[PDB]
Amino acid sequence: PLMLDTAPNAFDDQYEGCVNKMEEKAPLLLQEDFNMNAKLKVAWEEAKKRWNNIKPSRSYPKGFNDFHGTALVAYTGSIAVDFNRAVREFKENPGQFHYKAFHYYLTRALQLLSNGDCHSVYRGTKTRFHYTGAGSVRFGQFTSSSLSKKVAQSQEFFSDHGTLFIIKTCLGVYIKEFSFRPDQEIVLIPGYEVYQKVRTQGYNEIFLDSPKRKKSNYNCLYS
Ligand SMILES: NC(=O)c1ccc[n+]([C@@H]2O[C@@H](COP(=O)([O-])OP(=O)(O)OC[C@H]3O[C@@H](n4cnc5c(N)ncnc54)[C@H](O)[C@@H]3O)[C@@H](O)[C@H]2O)c1
Numbered sequence: 001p002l003m004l005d006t007a008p009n010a011f012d013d014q015y016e017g018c019v020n021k022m023e024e025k026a027p028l029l030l031q032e033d034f035n036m037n038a039k040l041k042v043a044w045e046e047a048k049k050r051w052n053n054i055k056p057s058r059s060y061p062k063g064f065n066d067f068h069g070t071a072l073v074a075y076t077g078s079i080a081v082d083f084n085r086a087v088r089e090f091k092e093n094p095g096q097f098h099y100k101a102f103h104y105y106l107t108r109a110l111q112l113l114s115n116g117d118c119h120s121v122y123r124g125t126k127t128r129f130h131y132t133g134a135g136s137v138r139f140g141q142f143t144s145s146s147l148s149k150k151v152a153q154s155q156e157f158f159s160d161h162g163t164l165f166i167i168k169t170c171l172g173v174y175i176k177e178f179s180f181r182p183d184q185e186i187v188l189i190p191g192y193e194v195y196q197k198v199r200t201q202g203y204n205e206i207f208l209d210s211p212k213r214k215k216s217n218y219n220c221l222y223s
Helices: 019-036 038-057 066-075 080-088 100-113 149-153
Strands: 002-004 119-124 129-131 143-146 164-169 186-189 193-201 205-213
Touching: 019 038, 019 066, 019 100, 038 066, 038 080, 066 080, 066 100, 080 100, 119 149, 119 186, 143 149, 143 164, 149 164, 164 186, 164 193
Parallel strands: 002 129, 164 205
Antiparallel strands: 119 143, 119 164, 143 186, 193 205
16 A cells, blocks of 8 residues: 655655746756666657657647657656656655656646646556545656546556546646557646545545645755
């Protein structure tokens, strides 16, 4: 079982007040990441190709560049697990965080593609999640979900040993074209979104409601 709390140790940078400085610094940062993170480098190079193919079929937000696009395609890829881990366990040893640039671009990508829109999404896991009664909840790491409860419950993501999250999010982003699917109706949720209403039902169902945007514990850490 894993704990569900306010994710006090997760690198949750929202980059308030440093977007301009980051867009200028992140490119160098990305090189540093690659030098210390072979897996990321591979994931990114492949993601880059894919993005070249996807980019022409549609128009993106002003400022939304190849870094944002490549970062997002990559997240829907296999690099997601390690990245999520590194973020979730940031405070546990911030010295070995080699996703400084990745984190920023992915965070920025979602912020740029975002609107006021809220969604009813579902998320399945094969690991039991226990809410430790903090009063509110944040995933900490970025977290994928699906508009379809069917997907979330498929043998792909869920099992009796796990948990089914029924989430009401307003910072989540529908990123169909970016995914490798595109049939899982993925909605990407930033780890810093806060759910003011938490409710466990049965042994493996958790409802998260009253989403709200709050300040993060970290801000412009690498700016
Ligand atoms: N999960 C879903 O319901 C769902 C739905 C649609 C698409 N996807 C897709 O999922 C991808 C994989 O994302 P994911 O859903 O597996 O997230 P993820 O891989 O983090 O989830 C798997 C698990 O990863 C590690 N983990 C996650 N949170 C943890 C925590 N708080 N503490 C300790 N370990 C933790 C644990 O093993 C956790 O059980 C891509 O394929 C994406 O398109 C997932």
